[PDB]
Amino acid sequence: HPDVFNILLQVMDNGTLTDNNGRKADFRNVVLVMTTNAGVRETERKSIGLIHQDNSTDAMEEIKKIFTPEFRNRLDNIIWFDHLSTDVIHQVVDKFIVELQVQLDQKGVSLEVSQEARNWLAEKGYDRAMGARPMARVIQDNLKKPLANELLFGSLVDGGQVTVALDKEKNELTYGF
């Protein structure tokens, strides 16, 4: 509720907040980070006309309308995160694959993914609109589901490892032991 923001005026400005017993919270050694999706619904909307408009000034409307001037004027900064680029997606995919590798290592099996397979997953899952969020699903469907069957029903348990590669004809992934 926007009135809850008022609680932070004295926090951001004096590092303090007083509890109902009269004791004071001391935030001088606290880093305050607030996150938001304000302005996104608007920045992602298509305009009507021959020329598409630049809707990057979301900061000028939603952030300003939501946060009272006295709140805003106490911030060190308002930082706009961008949509992730495709270069980033490749890095994101590598990151998620590593997370997968760790979960697999804990079960005594390991996973290798070819570069072609990685590029394919990255290319398949990219959606500028949803950032890095869907990449975890692309990995979930292309790597984790196959693996769960191999891990759960004996194909890939103790004694083996799995290598995943992309073919070119179908651009389908391989698996193994």
């Binding site: 298509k46 009507i48 006309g49 021959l50």
Partner: protein, 192 residues
């Protein structure tokens, strides 16, 4: 009731629409009567509006028009080519002159004409009063337009340019099946 109201069952409530607003929601735009600046301006606004609502769906332009101002028609023509969704045009009643011009300008494969409708094509009309030098300027401009219109007719119909020029020197009337053979439209709608 110059224009009847209708009500629609959706979710929150019936609201009401005056038929034309009701049909705009179905992506149907009606072009009727003379083409002029204000009416053309309104059609352009409607097409831009529909393009934004859903860039992936066709827009239907119902045409029943005797003709009109080329310039005004030109703004409709360009908007139709510019916007992403196909504009499908349907000729009913008549599509004459500039109306015919816009009819053929719809997306290929989507130009339809009802069975008893008439399509008429002709070279542009105009005129001017003034000094011989002023006449000379205006005469060249109308001729450039004529040439430009013939180029677009040929582009959209598939007729050679030479054939389009011959065929528009005098008013040419085409019945719905003649329009199909000529290439002004792709097909005739008959019964649902």
């Amino acid at each position: 009731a110059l224009v009847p109201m209708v009500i629609e069952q959706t979710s929150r409530g019936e609201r009401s629409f005056d038929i034309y607003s009701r049909l705009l929601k179905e992506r149907v735009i009606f072009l009727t009567g003379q083409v002029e600046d204000h009416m053309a301006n309104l059609i352009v606004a409607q097409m831009l509006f529909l393009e934004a609502e859903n860039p992936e769906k066709d827009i239907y332009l119902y045409i029943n028009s005797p003709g009109g101002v080329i310039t005004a028609g030109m703004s409709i023509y360009d908007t139709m080519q510019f916007i992403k969704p196909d504009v499908s045009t349907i000729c009913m009643g008549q599509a004459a002159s500039m109306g015919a011009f816009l009819l053929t300008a719809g997306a290929k494969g989507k130009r339809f004409c009802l069975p008893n409708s008439r399509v008429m094509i002709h070279q542009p009309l105009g005129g001017y009063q003034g000094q011989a030098t002023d006449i000379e300027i205006h005469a060249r401009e109308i001729l450039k337009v004529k040439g430009r219109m013939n180029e677009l007719m040929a582009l959209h119909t598939g007729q050679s340019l030479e054939q389009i020029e011959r065929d528009t020197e005098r008013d040419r009337f085409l019945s719905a099946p003649e329009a199909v053979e000529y290439g002004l439209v792709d097909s005739i709608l008959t019964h649902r």
